[PDB]
């Protein structure tokens, strides 16, 4: 079960998840392979803002998903 | 025999009640409608942030309270107990508005 996380920068990684995994779980996985803090990411799937407490199934994330990621800045 | 407070007794109670509280006194929707229709003659489209309307209401109520204090002072000076429109005009003259 692999879904694709497409960032605003045009760099798309290949991420393998589980059907029972959560939105929060994906955030920590990218830190393991890129060192990016989980809280600096804004996941946008199906046009609705994902929430940390929700799983990857509540939004019906089928495989080969184009997951659009927004990156935020701590300070303006 | 029905109960009836003498005139001027409920007025003092209302004075004491409303001089102790801080609640906004004018109805918010009518006030906002009045503000919006007044601004209709300066800019054709306005959006009037809720905090801005709240500030307008607070300022207007404070101004009216001060003006009525001065009107009461004029009324008491004129050896009266009630206020009259000429008391407001005098107060607004000494203050230098009109």
């Amino acid at each position: 079960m692999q879904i694709f996380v497409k960032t605003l920068t045009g760099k798309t990684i290949t991420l393998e998840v589980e059907p029972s995994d959560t939105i929060e779980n994906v955030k920590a996985k990218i830190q393991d392979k890129e060192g990016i803090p989980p809280d600096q990411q804004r996941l946008i799937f199906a046009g609705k803002q994902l929430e940390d407490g929700r799983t990857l199934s509540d939004y019906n994330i089928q495989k080969e998903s184009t997951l659009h990621l927004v990156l935020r800045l701590r300070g303006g | 025999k029905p109960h009836r407070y003498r005139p001027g007794t409920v007025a003092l109670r209302e004075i004491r009640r409303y001089q102790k509280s801080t609640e906004l006194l004018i109805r918010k929707l009518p006030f906002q409608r009045l503000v919006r229709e007044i601004a209709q003659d300066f800019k054709t489209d306005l959006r009037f942030q809720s905090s801005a309307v709240m500030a307008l209401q607070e300022a207007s109520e404070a101004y009216l309270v001060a003006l009525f204090e001065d009107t009461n002072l004029c009324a008491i000076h004129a050896k009266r107990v009630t206020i009259m429109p000429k008391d407001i005009q005098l107060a607004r003259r000494i203050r230098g508005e009109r």
């Binding site: - | 007794t9 001089q19 509280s21 008491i76």
Partner: protein
């Protein structure tokens, strides 16, 4: 190098001397600013804040409350004579007025 000690700490103040200095520079008040001016201004602001807060806290205690309210701030400012002079043209949101009734209006 030596340990960093803040300007407020070495002046004995609690207000930000550095922030006051930055605001003075970025305020278009003057081309240059002295070293002691931000310290002096921060001290004055701290004293005024303490002066207001003491009366506000006493007024809040008078109403059996452990938190400050705009009503308490209004009461303190309007009850102190010289604060009334500083803020006689200042209206406070949700502050109300002092309880006043002219003696003529009282019943005989």
């Amino acid at each position: 190098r030596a340990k960093a000690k803040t300007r407020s700490s070495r002046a004995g103040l609690q207000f930000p001397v550095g922030r006051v200095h930055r605001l003075l520079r970025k305020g278009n008040y003057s081309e240059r600013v002295g070293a002691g001016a931000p310290v002096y201004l921060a001290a004055v602001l701290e004293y005024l804040t303490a002066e207001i807060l003491e009366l506000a806290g006493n007024a809040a205690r008078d109403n059996k409350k452990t938190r400050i309210i705009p009503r308490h701030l209004q009461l303190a400012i309007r009850n102190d004579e010289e604060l009334n002079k500083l803020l006689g043209r200042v209206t406070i949101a949700q502050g109300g007025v002092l309880p006043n009734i002219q003696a003529v209006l009282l019943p005989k």
